[PDB]
Amino acid sequence: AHLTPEEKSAVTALWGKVNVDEVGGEALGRLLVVYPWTQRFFESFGDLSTPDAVMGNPKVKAHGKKVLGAFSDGLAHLDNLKGTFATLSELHCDKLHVDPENFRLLGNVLVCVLAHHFGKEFTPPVQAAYQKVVAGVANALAHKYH
């Protein structure tokens, strides 16, 4: 990986406390609110007009859960992120046409959400370990683009 033992323990520990369903929904909703251009991928999700609409949308909540669950799987294979995300990398490129820059934005919003959710437990060193992961995942997903 990119991560250190101190950093893997850091990552793994915090992740045990995350409610994937809840965090996923928050992370995707915030992406759509903070960087509205990202809404171009979700025209069929319904009302995305205001922050409250975005945040309460069931389809956003559903999708967020899907994304973070896949994200969680990668946490189990921190040593082979590329192998792990190969199929999804190809899917996002070939069928979905998602600019990989979106993976980077989501990673940053996720960090924001963890800090918001965990407060003082989300210390500078823990953040640093999560920044490495998020960058790693984004790189893994962009890997099969062509």
Partner: protein, 141 residues
């Protein structure tokens, strides 16, 4: 901020481009698609084969827009208003991609204006493209 000298530089270089603006616009796009393949994610509906009418047509529209901006270099916000609306509300291109096309336009100009691409003109064009990019991205949020 474009200085007076910058505006002079841009008008000089762009002038030289003249009637080739559209062909140069097409070449810059092809350079971008090849160098930065993630940019293709915004053109899944296009035939991106070398010399396709779609790319040539698009390159022309891009070049026309740039000419418009040079012409109204003192009032870009107003001159590119409609285009800034289109990009912000419809196209929704991540802002990172503007820097990639800008670089490819710079390379295109460099390859075609041996005499005019001095360090000073290079600097002015870079600033000019950054300015256009800023205006086109202005209404995103």
């Amino acid at each position: 901020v474009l200085s007076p000298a910058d505006k002079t530089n841009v008008k000089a270089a762009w002038g030289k481009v003249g009637a080739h603006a559209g062909e140069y616009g097409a070449e810059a796009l092809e350079r971008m698609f090849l160098s930065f393949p993630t940019t293709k994610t915004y053109f899944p509906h296009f035939d991106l084969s070398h010399g396709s009418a779609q790319v040539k047509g698009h390159g022309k529209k891009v070049a026309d827009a740039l000419t418009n901006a040079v012409a109204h270099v003192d009032d870009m916000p107003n001159a590119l208003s409609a285009l800034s609306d289109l990009h912000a509300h419809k196209l929704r291109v991540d802002p990172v991609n503007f820097k990639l096309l800008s670089h490819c336009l710079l390379v295109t100009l460099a390859a075609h204006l041996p005499a005019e691409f001095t360090p000073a003109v290079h600097a002015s064009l870079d600033k000019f493209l950054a300015s256009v990019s800023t205006v086109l991205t202005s209404k995103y949020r």
